[PDB]
Amino acid sequence: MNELEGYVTKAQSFRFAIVVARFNEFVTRRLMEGALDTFKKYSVNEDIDVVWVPGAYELGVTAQALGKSGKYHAIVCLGAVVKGDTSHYDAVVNSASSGVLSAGLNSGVPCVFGVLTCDNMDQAINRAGGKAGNKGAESALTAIEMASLFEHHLK
Amino acid sequence: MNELEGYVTKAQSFRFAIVVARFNEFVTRRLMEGALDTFKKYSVNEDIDVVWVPGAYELGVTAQALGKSGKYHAIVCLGAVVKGDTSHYDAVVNSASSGVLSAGLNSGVPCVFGVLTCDNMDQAINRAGGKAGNKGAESALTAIEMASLFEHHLK
Amino acid sequence: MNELEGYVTKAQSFRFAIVVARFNEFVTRRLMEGALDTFKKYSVNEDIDVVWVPGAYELGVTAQALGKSGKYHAIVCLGAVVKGDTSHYDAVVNSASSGVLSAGLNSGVPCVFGVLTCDNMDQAINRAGGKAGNKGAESALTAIEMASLFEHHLK
Amino acid sequence: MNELEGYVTKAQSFRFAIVVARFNEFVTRRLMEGALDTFKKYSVNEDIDVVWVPGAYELGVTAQALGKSGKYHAIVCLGAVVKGDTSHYDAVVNSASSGVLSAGLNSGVPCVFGVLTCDNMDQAINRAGGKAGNKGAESALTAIEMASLFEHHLK
Amino acid sequence: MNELEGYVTKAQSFRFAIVVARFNEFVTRRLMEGALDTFKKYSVNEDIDVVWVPGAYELGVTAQALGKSGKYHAIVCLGAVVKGDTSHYDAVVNSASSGVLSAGLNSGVPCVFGVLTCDNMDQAINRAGGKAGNKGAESALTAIEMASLFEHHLK
Amino acid sequence: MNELEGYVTKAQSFRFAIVVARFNEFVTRRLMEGALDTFKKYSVNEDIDVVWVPGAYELGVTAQALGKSGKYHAIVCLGAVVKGDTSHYDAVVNSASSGVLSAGLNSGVPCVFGVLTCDNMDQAINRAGGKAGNKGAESALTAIEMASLFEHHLK
Amino acid sequence: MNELEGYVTKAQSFRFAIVVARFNEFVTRRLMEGALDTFKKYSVNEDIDVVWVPGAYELGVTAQALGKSGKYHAIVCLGAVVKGDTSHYDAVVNSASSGVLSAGLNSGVPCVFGVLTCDNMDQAINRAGGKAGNKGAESALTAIEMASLFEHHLK
């Protein structure tokens, strides 16, 4: 019993990267803006890199890279894939999810899965600062905590 | 806040490869033609390699190879698997998707998932230059952006 | 058989103007932001003029003017008229459409009809960077192509 | 990116004309009174000309004239055609709309389409200062903005 | 009673231009190919100019231009606008139609309205060389006849 | 644009291996016989190794091995898992699919997924030389093409 | 435009007080524990006073007092009133709400309304650290922000 929890207060010193898919920009832009804001709100400053990728599928390798560059402590990946029609949804969703996972694992760097996978657009709108909160921001906050966790727990 | 976005304008200098499955040729051919056209339309010239594989399943390794050959900056994989009957659809779809993912990750080279996974043929027709746009073309464009992103962001 | 197509690559040298209606701002703002972004994304730079008009009806004359000023090569008109209730929808929609048409014809300058005419707000949201893409951006891109077409084909 | 927007504050110096159809006077009178009031409310003073025409159909030429007289900077046309029975509604509605459009285009002078085209009387009542606001006033305001836009943007 | 009919046999000597919208390319390409083929099939040779415009809306001015260039005897405009969802369909369809009309009238040069306006994609597929024939080809043939008519009837 | 396609004609010189699961032998036997036949039909001769494994699950490692033995150019895996009752179907199906995938990737050797995943026995019967063709044969043909592709494209 | 926002980072220096109603302890306890934790989590330290009152009704005066004591910068009030049966729910709910409001206003000290007013117990459970987050924690965080806001904005 020794609660090794991350610290949300010791931000500023860290370096983060946001990776966002342009798809469903209407939401993602917001999502991102949210994450961004949260960072600053949490005193962090090293002017976080935001990498734009066209689609959620992309998140995987992109994070992969950024992670392996050892330049950041945590990368948060944002995207939104609304269940529009076909299983294509699934396809992407899986790849997206899987990718981010693999990235984090392989890089040994926390990669935050801040991608919406709701059915209809509306639900999404809510996760992007609606009555459902803002995944973007949450993700950022998480990025912080994780990073911090890593340099406090380390082992 | 330093928007590291790819460049669609600085094409020409790059080397790409398209990998297409012959299955559902009626659509794939189109799909490919689209990607191809887009490349040229975007001033790129190194006469892109188009690799034909019989089925979407194949995409995985094929890309895998091309990717590891270090010869291309981005490989776009095209295919179309229409929900014809059985879970076979799923089987393929997953493998297809997973493969392309793995390829991109392992190769560290962007592999574009330009494969249709609609239910009926008609929906597909639409993604192949119908009122739903043209995934082929979109994929190409994406290939570009990703490649470019990699040599601008790099780290 | 001599494919006289426009060029999306030779942007920068051209001068464009966006005309947007404030009505349904929630969408139009986005729409516009999209077109704008696309311009820059396509290396164009002469800091495009954005003209705000209260309603889509206005587009007509406004474009008319800008067009006749011979200052721009293509003007893109953005607006969104959602089928809220009465035939008023039609009224506007027609006038809007007709206006933009007339403008283009009379001015001999491509005036892009980038105005949404969906029924419900939601559909619109989708055309403004949702799973339906972004008409704004599309329109911009088109503006480019058309302008370019005109100085390559000319006759 | 140079937001060329009109100015609602620099009114007074301008000259406007309202053209109203006597038909459905119960509403139009109001409508007009609204536009009028708004003008004064917006410090404008050159005692705006209000031209009465029996029916909305008339708006066309009447505006046409006023516009070509070069005396006004913007003419706002008011009328209300409630879907009472037959396609006559359409007939008028179209002509009305079309007319105002043509006027504006031909005259190069902003002609505001401040004519209601609701189905039932009640809906109209609402657009004439009901819970739906007041088209008349809106129209006036718009007239202002358009005029102003023209002498600030001009080209 | 003096049947002034055009001649489909005296082609070759004439100069034509095809204008096609990229939208719904899947069909338009075909449509065009059809028109093209027909021309050659009808011994015509001056290697017809094919002008690509992104959307049917564009047809108007584009034709307008080509027509006024006095270089061609007849311009055939191809496009296809499938009733996908909203009245947007109408908007476009009208503008498209109207444009081509205006062009022909203003230019005094026959502009063939070879644009499909079916509801579903499938119907279109049929007009593009299906059991419904090929509008593209038909349009070409018509272009010929009209041109010829003009130089035989003239007055 | 340089179509790097495999060759079905240059077979004979290559070495292949078929791996078949005994489960649902009634179909698999056929399936295999089909693949086999096709090979010979395509002039190949090095008397292809056929490896029997009890169940489709097994395919994975088995192929894995054969692949890594570097002895063959392509291994085709055959099996059939009919949706008899429980998710067990899925379990197997996934493992089967995944296995073959992994094999191909890890070995860098094309491993053909020639395993049926239909619901009822009958559908299968059809894929095994019924009105649905013969997956076995198709798979063989594919094995060929892939192998060939690898030594023609290589890089 | 000068965004006067509170600071979540500059906590520690402040003094807060939590007031919780014992009713529905099963939830409130949690609720409180949450708020508490958050405080610490946000580096605050002056060992926050937690005042227990039997029912939500009490919150009013209790806060009233604490607020007027000028000892704390923000008091967060926690409670939960589940719509068990009668309008009694309302009665309490109103008084509770109203009280906290009045307190905040009269004291000029931010009093956070961290009281659940869901219908069934279950919904509550969710707000108390379930998939609905934790109102308690949120309230604390807010307390912080408000306090901070007051000493940064002040006027």
Ligand SMILES: O=Nc1c(NC[C@H](O)[C@H](O)[C@H](O)CO)[nH]c(=O)[nH]c1=O
């Ligand atoms: O398609 N739907 C979506 C999408 N595109 C798929 C993918 O990300 C990619 O761009 C190309 O498929 C191949 O690389 N991307 C999203 O972020 N959300 C979606 O809902």
Ligand SMILES: O=Nc1c(NC[C@H](O)[C@H](O)[C@H](O)CO)[nH]c(=O)[nH]c1=O
């Ligand atoms: O079967 N349907 C499809 C398909 N074939 C499956 C697979 O790609 C492969 O060729 C062999 O199964 C063994 O590897 N490939 C597609 O691209 N789309 C389909 O809709």
Ligand SMILES: O=Nc1c(NC[C@H](O)[C@H](O)[C@H](O)CO)[nH]c(=O)[nH]c1=O
């Ligand atoms: O009224 N609805 C709409 C609207 N106003 C009508 C018109 O554009 C104009 O502003 C004045 O009518 C004078 O003509 N403008 C829109 O862009 N969308 C609508 O949905």
Ligand SMILES: O=Nc1c(NC[C@H](O)[C@H](O)[C@H](O)CO)[nH]c(=O)[nH]c1=O
């Ligand atoms: O008829 N109904 C209407 C009407 N009259 C039609 C028209 O303007 C004209 O007076 C004569 O048709 C011939 O010029 N005018 C309206 O403003 N609203 C109506 O509801």
Ligand SMILES: O=Nc1c(NC[C@H](O)[C@H](O)[C@H](O)CO)[nH]c(=O)[nH]c1=O
């Ligand atoms: O939107 N739907 C369609 C479309 N786009 C509209 C237009 O052609 C144009 O490109 C811009 O609107 C403004 O210039 N064009 C079509 O050929 N079919 C459609 O079904």
Ligand SMILES: O=Nc1c(NC[C@H](O)[C@H](O)[C@H](O)CO)[nH]c(=O)[nH]c1=O
């Ligand atoms: O159970 N049904 C099936 C099956 N058995 C499962 C598996 O292949 C394996 O033999 C053992 O599970 C673990 O090695 N194998 C098939 O080829 N088809 C089936 O339809």
Ligand SMILES: O=Nc1c(NC[C@H](O)[C@H](O)[C@H](O)CO)[nH]c(=O)[nH]c1=O
């Ligand atoms: O009674 N129900 C509730 C309650 N007690 C009522 C009230 O707070 C008070 O204690 C006395 O009524 C009068 O002072 N307090 C709650 O947090 N939830 C309830 O659902």
